[PDB]
Structure formats: structure tokens, C-alpha cells
Amino acid sequence: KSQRSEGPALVLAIGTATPSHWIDQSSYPDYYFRVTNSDHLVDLKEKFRRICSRTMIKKRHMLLTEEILKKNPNLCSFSEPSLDIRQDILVSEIPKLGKEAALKAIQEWAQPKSTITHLVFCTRSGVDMPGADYQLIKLLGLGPSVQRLMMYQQGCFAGGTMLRLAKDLAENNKGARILVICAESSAIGFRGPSESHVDNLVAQALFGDGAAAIIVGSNPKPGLEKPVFEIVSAAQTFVPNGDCHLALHLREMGLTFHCTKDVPPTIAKNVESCLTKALEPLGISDWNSLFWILHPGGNAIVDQVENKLGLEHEKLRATRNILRDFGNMSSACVLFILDEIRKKSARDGLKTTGEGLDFGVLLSFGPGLTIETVVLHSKPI
Amino acid sequence: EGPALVLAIGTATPSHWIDQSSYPDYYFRVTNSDHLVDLKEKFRRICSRTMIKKRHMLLTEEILKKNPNLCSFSEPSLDIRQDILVSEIPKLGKEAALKAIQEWAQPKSTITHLVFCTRSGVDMPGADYQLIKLLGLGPSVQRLMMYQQGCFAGGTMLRLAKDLAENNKGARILVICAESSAIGFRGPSESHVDNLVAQALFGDGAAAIIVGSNPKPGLEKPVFEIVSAAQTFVPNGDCHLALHLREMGLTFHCTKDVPPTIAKNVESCLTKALEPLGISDWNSLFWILHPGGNAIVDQVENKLGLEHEKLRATRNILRDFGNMSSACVLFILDEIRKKSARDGLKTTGEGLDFGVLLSFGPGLTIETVVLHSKPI
């Protein structure tokens, strides 16, 4: 089965999109404390500058503009009722951003959009019924008989989940072509600063906005489709008691953020057993023989995974590039990284979409200390 | 090594329940609305037309008394609804799951996948994660968490579990649909009479199924086969049926056009699903219909010319539990095979071979699942 052409699920195209508005990380402490009327919190601001400095983020794209914040001062408070305005923004803007990424993926794929048979939409940024998947069908002009799955409120690990899901959809449905969209916005969790909640500043420094789209299918059409990656395997686990360490709740004040200082080291010390379970059946034990896609949950996690696994320093370069240029875009990050890794492969004149290597690993993680591990195979560049 | 099979079905409800005949009195009393005499009479008529006899509910008089925002029409209430539901929804799902696992009779450690479905609250990590903890399963169970889907999603979960079971050798999927009207319960308002429909209709419950291909001879006993599953929607359906999650909890928008629009679109779904099997006589099937309300049941029966007993299991579940959103069609699957055994019929599908399960929900989404019965 893994050896057939009516065989494994393949990534056939990748497209990405961001809101046009962006903000530079160097000037974000000034922007944030000004627009939330918090410049009198001098010590807190300096704390925020240090946090922003340690992120290794250079810019983030943002659906939320100064004009929107000024029209909606509840957004600038720490915890006044704000879910309704976040929903009004996100229920409209998330499918539109997903549409932009989808159009770029469909353009690369170069097949008619009417041959898409399935749609998977993933976001933790707002919820509605019918969902963003339904809205996206309307915005893209697809037919009502596209088979939809709407994945709400998943969080940072869910790019790996969507690959896991897409693999089964593509492999069990002859001819199926799956449009998968991860679209995320920090507008669900943006809030003003508070000296009694300093830990929330981490979230305000980290999260950015963006959407990624992929086309997934088995049995590629010769001379028409050009596979980018093969999804070899995908598996989920979690670290027991991880929900005490990493969790987010949807409340009247929007999305909250609970993340302890234990999170980076606990993730880092659990990734090797995930790698072994996924890669030992393929006879791979040298993690530097792989290309790498890592969810950049924060810079500390990237560094600690590199150090715990003994990866060469350039292995996580594509990951660091995406963290630098876009910040943490939750489930969409690993798909931006997937796109980046093949783009960088072409720039460096390498011979496969995976930095000239055959096998790769995509590892994501999120609430509950859930970890998703996807083994990938590259394709000729 | 073939089709996905339903290997077991279990169901559970909150212990607290209210009879529909006395619900107008309960509802207007506990929300301090007895001065709205004409509105109470409208509500009596609405409750009368539901054909619902009882509903189970997580929300008790004590909880309402302690949380008067719940008894208002639109004061901020999402936080208390979340505090209740984030805890109670996985526990209710666990009760249904234990009953399904008991019927299945295999060790719970051999479950490989978990699909959890609810529109009643959201959290990260989700109710799926909580359920793993409550059931004592391992962290390596493969989870999919389906939040905020709505009434059609029992059909969706079948569609999804079919692919999980058929593409993963040996996989055994625990699928849970757990729902509570506590997300949308609110007091009455004379400027929002249409919300009384929702207050009359929704109830609480959870259903669990085990799905897998390649059953173990002499150990597993298949109940149904999932032959095929397909989704569609009626264009512009979101103008007729939609629910928004707000600071006041879940809202409800449902026009009077919903029952006839659904009823007039089901036949094309049936034809697309069943023509490839060479079936065109809808009375040769057993039937599972999402009882979105009594009017939809009647209008589907009438538009398709079904014999009146075809939708009996559907009406039984509407009567005994009300509209439990995505869980309804799985209660009805359980009920149709129980009624088959009671009537001494020879298959789990009222003695017939092929059946159809049809659900519908927000956006006028319609899910159509073709089922095959099994020996009783």
C-alpha cells in the first residue's frame, strides 16, 4: 500500500496568506502600550520590551488595526466583555483569509477548483454555525456537495492533526482532492495589559495572524499534478497532566492563556519518544538525517528541542524563519514552514523539496501538551 | 477487511428531567416570568405542538437559582454555561461510552481512536482530552475533537468514522456525541417570541458507538454497516438556520421555511446515495431521521410517501428525550435495533437489509448515510 500509486496521501500544493496590516516587533511595545492607554505602566512596559526582545519575532500580521481598537475600547481592556466584537470580526475575516491562502494553493495545483471533493477548515479564532467551512465554500464558488469537516477550537498542534485527517480522507476515497485550510488570528486573545496578570504579556508578544492552505490527494495525475511531499504517517499523543501546563479557555473576555514555565522543557524531553515510535518502523534513528518542521511555539522551545535532540543548528532554520517573519500563527505555522522548507530548498539549489533529503518529520504541539508527529517524504524539486 | 461497522451503541442522559406537559409552568416560574400571561399561553401551545413528552437536563432549579443571569434573556452568561458544560459534557459522554464498551465486550485499551462531537461549550484541550482521562485510556489514543457542529453532526461523525476505520487496519473508533440545551437556555422575552421554539425543543443526552472494520469472529457482533455517507447543503440555507455563540450563550435563528425546504430537498439526497445500489423505493428501507422538530418528521413522511410506521423509532426518541442535536440519530439507531428485537424481527433494521440515516442542521446542511442491517 505504502508502495502503490493508488497509494499514499500527497501534498500537491501549498499556499499562504496574511492580513495586509503588520507591525514590527521592535516597535510593538510602544504601539501596544500607547493604543491600550497604558503608558503610565512604566515598569510593565519595560517588562514587555524584554519579553518581545526574547521572542526572536521580527514582525506579525494583524487583522486588528488601530482604527478597530479605537472603535472598540473593550478590546483594549484586560477583561471587559469582548467576545461579541471578536466574533463579529473573526466570523467574517477568518474565512476570507482562508480564501486568500486557498486561491494561492489552487493556483499552484493548477487543476480546476471544481474538482476539489473535500474541505477541512481549522481555526481556534472564533466559532459559528454554520462554520467558516460553509462560508469558504460560498467565497470560493465551490459546489454544495463538497464534503466538509469543520475543526474549531483546536489550537497550536492542529496543523499536524489536519495532515493526520487529510491522509485518511485522501487514501480512503478514490480520486478525492482535499482542500485543507488552517486560518488563525490573535484577535481572539488580544487584550490590554494588567500588572496583576503579567503572564498574559507572553501571549501578547507571541501570536500573529495568517492562513495556510494545502491540496492533498492520492494517485497524482501524471504530467498534471506535481507532488510536493508525501504524508508517510501521522500520530498523536499527549504528556499526562499537560492540561495543568498549557490551556486556553473561551470566555466572555475572549480567549485566555495558561502556560507554565515547565512547558518548553516538558515538550523537549518528550519529543524523542515520539520520533522513535514514528521512525523506528522505517529504520531511521539519526535525527540529523531528516529534514525538520517544528511548530515554533516560542523561541525557547525551538532552542530546547535543538539541544535535547542534538540537531545541527541549520535543521530548524525554516522554522526560525517563519517565527521571525510572522510570529506564532497557531495551527497554520507548520504549514507556512512546510512551504518555506521547499522554497529554501529551491533557493539553495537542492535536489528535493526537503533540503535534498528523503525523509522528514513535522512535529507540532499544543494545549494539554498534545504532540502530533507526522513523517514526511520529500519529492524531486 | 472491508466496510466500517457499528459494533456497539450506548446512550446516557442526565438524571434530572422535566415532563413537557408541566414545562410551561416550570419555565415561567423559575425565570420569574409568570406576569407574562399571554406569552406563557403561546409557550403552552408551542410545547403542545412539539410531540415531546420529556427532556433530560443538566440545568436544575438549584443551578438556575444560583445563577440568575441564566434566567434572563440576554445578560452575560457564557462564563457560567462554560463552567457547567466543560465539566459535565465529558462526564455524560463517559456514561454513554461505558455502555457502548460494555456491549462491545472488548477491553477498552484496544480503542485506538476517539471522536468527540458537541455544540455545548468549547475548551482547549477539549472534551476529548477530558474523556481520555475520565475513561482511563492511554495518551496514544488518536483524538479528533469536533466542536460547534450542530444538529447534522451525527451523520458527519459516521462519515468520518467510516474513513478512520477503513483506512487504519485494526482501528477501533469510539465516537461520542454529547449535547446539552444548557448552552442555549434563557428566559422568555416578548420581543423575541421565536426563541420560545428553542426553549421548547432541546434536551440533553449523549450517545456513543464503537466503529471498526474486520470484526473478530465470535468476539464482536456487528450491529450495522456504514455503506456510504455524503454531505450537501441547500444554497442560502444559512439565511434560514443559524446559531451564534455570543456573550449571552448560543442564539437560535430558524425560519418557518426550514421544514418545507428540508423536506423538498431530501429526495435528491436519497437518489444520489441509493441509485448506485439500485434502490428507488424508499419504503423498502428502514429509516433514521433527525427529529429537528415534529413538523419536519411529518413533512418528510408526506413528501416521500413513507408508510406511517417508518419514522416510529424517530418519533419515539423525540417523545422520550426531545431534540438532543447531534446525538439524536444515534439514540434512534439504538432504538431501531431495540424495537427490532422487541418485535421479533430478524435484522437490526426492522427485518430489512438497507436503511438510510438522514440528518440536517445549520446552513441547511444535510448528511445522508446508507446503512446495512445485521442479523438480530
Author numbering:
A (entry chain A): 11 to 391
B (entry chain B): 16 to 391
What did the article's authors report about this structure?
Very recently, tropinone biosynthesis has been investigated, and it has been shown that the key intermediate 4-(1-methyl-2-pyrrolidinyl)-3-oxobutanoic acid (2)18 results from an atypical type III polyketide synthase (PKS) AbPYKS catalyzed condensation between 1 and malonyl-CoA, whereas tropinone is formed by a P450 enzyme AbCYP82M3-mediated oxidation and cyclization of racemic 2. Herein, we report the characterization of three PYKSs, AaPYKS, DsPYKS, and AbPYKS, from three respective plants, Anisodus acutangulus, Datura stramonium, and Atropa belladonna as well as the condensation mechanism based on the crystal structures of AaPYKS. In this study, we clearly demonstrated that AaPYKS only takes one-round of malonyl-CoA condensation to form free acid 5, and then undergo the non-enzymatic Mannich-like condensation with the substrate N-methylpyrrolinium to afford 2. There is no reported type III PKS that takes one round of sole malonyl-CoA condensation in natural product biosynthesis, thereby, PYKS may represent an emerging class of plant type III PKSs.
